[PDB]
Write a protein that binds this ligand. Sequence first.
Ligand SMILES: CCC(=O)SCCNC(=O)CCNC(=O)[C@H](O)C(C)(C)COP(=O)(O)OP(=O)(O)OC[C@H]1O[C@@H](n2cnc3c(N)ncnc32)[C@H](O)[C@@H]1OP(=O)(O)O
Ligand SMILES: Nc1ncnc2c1ncn2[C@@H]1O[C@H](COP(=O)(O)OP(=O)(O)O)[C@@H](O)[C@H]1O
Ligand SMILES: *C(=O)CCCC[C@@H]1SC[C@@H]2NC(=O)N[C@@H]21
Ligand SMILES: [Mg+2]
Lengths: 261, 673, 247
Amino acid sequence: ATSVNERIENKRRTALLGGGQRRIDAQHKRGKLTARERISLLLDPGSFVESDMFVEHRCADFGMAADKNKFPGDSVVTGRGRINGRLVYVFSQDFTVFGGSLSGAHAQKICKIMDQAITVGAPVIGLNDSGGARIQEGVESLAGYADIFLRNVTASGVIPQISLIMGPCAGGAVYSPALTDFTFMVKDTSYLFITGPDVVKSVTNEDVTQEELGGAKTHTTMSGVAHRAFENDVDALCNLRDFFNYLPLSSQDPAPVRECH
Amino acid sequence: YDPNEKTFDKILVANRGEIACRVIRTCKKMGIKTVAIHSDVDASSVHVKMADEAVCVGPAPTSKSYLNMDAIMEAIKKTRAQAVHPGYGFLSENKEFARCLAAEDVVFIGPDTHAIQAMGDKIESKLLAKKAEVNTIPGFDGVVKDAEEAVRIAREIGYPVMIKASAGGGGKGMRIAWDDEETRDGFRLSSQEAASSFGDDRLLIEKFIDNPRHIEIQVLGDKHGNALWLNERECSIQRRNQKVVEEAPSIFLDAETRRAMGEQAVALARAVKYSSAGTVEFLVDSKKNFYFLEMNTRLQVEHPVTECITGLDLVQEMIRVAKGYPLRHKQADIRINGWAVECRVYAEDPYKSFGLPSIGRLSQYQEPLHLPGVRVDSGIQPGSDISIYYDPMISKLITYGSDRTEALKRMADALDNYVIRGVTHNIALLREVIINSRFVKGDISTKFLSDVYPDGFKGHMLTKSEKNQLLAIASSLFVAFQLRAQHFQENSRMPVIKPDIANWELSVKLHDKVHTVVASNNGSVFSVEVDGSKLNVTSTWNLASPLLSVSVDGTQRTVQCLSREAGGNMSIQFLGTVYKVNILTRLAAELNKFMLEKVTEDTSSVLRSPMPGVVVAVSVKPGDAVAEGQEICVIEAMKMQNSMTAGKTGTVKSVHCQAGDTVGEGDLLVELE
Amino acid sequence: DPSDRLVPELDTIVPLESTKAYNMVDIIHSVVDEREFFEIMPNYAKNIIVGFARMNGRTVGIVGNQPKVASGCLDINSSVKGARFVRFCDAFNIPLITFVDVPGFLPGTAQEYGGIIRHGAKLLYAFAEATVPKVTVITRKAYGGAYDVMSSKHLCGDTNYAWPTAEIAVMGAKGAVEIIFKGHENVEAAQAEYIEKFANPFPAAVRGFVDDIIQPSSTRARICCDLDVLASKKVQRPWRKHANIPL
Ligand SMILES: CCC(=O)SCCNC(=O)CCNC(=O)[C@H](O)C(C)(C)COP(=O)(O)OP(=O)(O)OC[C@H]1O[C@@H](n2cnc3c(N)ncnc32)[C@H](O)[C@@H]1OP(=O)(O)O
Ligand SMILES: Nc1ncnc2c1ncn2[C@@H]1O[C@H](COP(=O)(O)OP(=O)(O)O)[C@@H](O)[C@H]1O
Ligand SMILES: *C(=O)CCCC[C@@H]1SC[C@@H]2NC(=O)N[C@@H]21
Ligand SMILES: [Mg+2]
């Protein structure tokens, strides 16, 4: 008798449930979904296939060798699907597990998805919901951003890259959306800033909150970083679907032609 | 040196810089472990890396790092040091330091406490010397009483009247008077300045010697009552009462006078019961009459030069004496072997006040160790930094030869192959003094720098032939750079066509004059036409090395190109002096005459500080009116205080200097109309 | 000018204290041939330095941080100033030499309202798409994602070096201890342990992030030899009409 079957089911249940039901309830109380139903709403029904669902982080310092600091998926859901019959590769970040902070496995999965997409010639859509880089990981975390950043420059001009900020992205993770072709934000829910208001108050002796520092209105009215702002998650995904419907798959293909009346 | 003999196994050096390095080298040669002390600024000095172990003693100021006895004693106790060498300065001649060290168990390399106590003030030293049958100044001995007593003394001491501050000296309270009324007014001025002095409030009246010559006798003694005099030393070239150029054998003295001086010095040392190395200083007139003047109970700065004519090592001998061993030499064993000349290279600008301190970081530094008969003693290295708290001494250079002429020629050669980039030095003044006709002849005095340059040091005044050589070298260097700029690699797509030019016609602007130069190249040989004069210069034309050796008409010269730019400005070091020239082509020079002259909004009325440091006292306030020749404020940096002069009349609009702040070099200080 | 000339004056140029500022122009002058350096835009955005020099007779582009001005923090102007120069140097086949001393990006409301993200992305892209040989030397520090912005090893960099006084981390010690050891409410021993363990280049050295830790006096001799072996660099990349600069 082998217990390799029940462990698979337990790992699947933990991956679906994330880091716990209390964090899920906290996610919903802000009027905010989680990664998996975002993916389901974005993609066609019964067309999403997920890659690398059994990957764990390999941290060994600051007491993460215990099971309480171990979570399957490593706060990222990556895969491929179809929109209106055309292939696409997607990745979404989960704030439940360590606030979506970058780890080795997170960057590895993102890089693998980008490599596959650039190999086959399909667009990449990224739903960004993070909190920065994991400090306990160390320099290994920083390299992850680099391993992403290079792949954002290699694929620039080859395949379209779309980014949608769905939460408070901060730190060095804000540079990946700036290196993509288009940027979209959800108002009253998403933020973008290099440093938090606390550091600004400490250094420049100036008082400001997160909404006025990195809010959607600031980045869509005077900063010029984002392109459009949407009311909520469902409207954002609905608009992103037809926006993707406009644009082609790769620079080797001609502009799409539809049926006119 | 014999390492078999028993000697201390741990020496702590209580100094910094050059003398610490010298002592460290000596004990390393003698196989003795050493310990070094340093402040926070000197944590990266040369002497803290040469010596095993290092102890931090406190902050940057000397009052808390090198003069803090508690820190030194704690370091000695922690390091289990058995002996301490003070070098010179700081605590070398401190009365309480000797007792504090000799209390527990520590032996102090130097004179005993009684010797320092006796030779510490100018009152009892004179009477002690008189009791030892030593020639002294015929000035009256005794503390002055009042103006009437002062003039009564001045009646029978001679028409020239010296007034001096007792006890501590250092160039304070030293004043002149001739006339009896002038004598009494100078005496009351001396009395009031002594009342405002450090506290002695005692004056000494004395006689002047006309055209003084400062001679020194190096004495060495032990604890068994033996005393030796190691020849004499000539030190007359001084500014601000500080020696710059040293000469071991005295060209002014014969055998009999030298013997008499040495015997008198030995007798004086025996009277004091001296048991270490020291120097006795004398003032000598034209009639070879020598008078005693002060005794230094420590190791002197100019000690290496007398080592070049005797072959002894003073540091090793004095360490052996402090150990308790009798001297292994006799008087008949000391002989003069050749000639030796020493120069003291400082970090200061000689063009103002014969040297004013400057700071900076050494971009690069190279010594002429490959030249024959050259020895360099330095406590610096490439990348070293110069702070504002210590003496600005960079290094000392010693050259020895068979006779005076060879030593002087070697010194002149060595002063040209010395590379210092990063700070300003006084090498030009040294080279000008060395090749001076009066210095070569041998008629010098303590006022040598006061009459040769009555207004100040203006650089080397070069003759017509030297000017032609300089212009030819500059033109040749410019043409060599232009020719080097044309050498590319083969492209195989757009081949380069090297321009074919025969002659280069150039306009060279030097000082405030313009010369026309024609340059021709024939490989490694340049032919130069300078105002109708033929010159021929050859060299390897290595444009990367900091030293260029050229031959102009058979004469060998060494030059250094300090700075060069595309605008034509070049800074070239010729004969130890830096010259600025502007080289242009004929067409460029002709077209440059149409350029409008750039307005320069600096016509006096500016009092930019000539030296960095901390101002201690400002004598004016904003809105006041100043007068010519009146000091404004006093800035203290590198052991000295300097007050800038005046010469224009106006109203000070603002004052940017306050007591306790730090002022950088070239910073605007006083603004006036 | 020999290619193996030593530069002993660079051994103690970097102060021991982390709050003191030095001059990178002195290091550039010491390293390059004949102390000659042609600076571009010397009076604008003084916290970054860009220029042309020669190494063993070969034209090179020098880019570096200036700790003397604004502690070396990056801002809007310096990002564009460096990015344009790097793009030109790549476009006309010129090797790049980089000196890294950066604590991060300059914070404030004006920088965020001006779009610092776009210009940081410009500079990062300019270093990322570089195909000419690149040599990087880290002098004192490189904090946060800015370390990636300065052509780290992971952006297809060829050779990276670090001086013994260098140190690389994620953030400062205070931020790390206040974001990791929050429950312990004791930063006395925690800060000491963090600065003893991570305030040094070994964590990046043991993980292969930096090629070697070299003495400063041998910096020049290390660079020239590298420029001898990287002169034949060739990189193949996917075809495209032109990429999308974040202009
Ligand atoms: C390359 C440049 C870098 O390295 S940037 C590194 C990030 N530096 C920082 O100072 C962290 C900034 N992040 C934040 O302030 C918050 O997470 C923001 C973005 C405001 C989210 O808002 P908020 O809902 O109030 O957060 P929260 O109180 O619910 O905390 C949730 C949990 O997320 C975690 N988290 C966040 N970021 C990291 C990170 N980089 N590394 C490790 N953990 C992180 C927090 O530990 C927090 O834990 P907890 O559940 O509150 O106990
Ligand atoms: N009686 C004197 N007569 C003529 N010149 C003197 C006399 N005393 C001093 N001078 C000058 O004073 C200067 C310094 O005298 P000194 O006793 O050595 O003090 P210090 O220890 O500060 O050097 C000498 O160089 C000398 O030129
Ligand atoms: C300051 O750092 C003390 C050492 C420098 C002065 C010492 S002591 C007196 C000697 N005369 C001189 O010019 N240097 C020597
Ligand atoms: Mg004296």
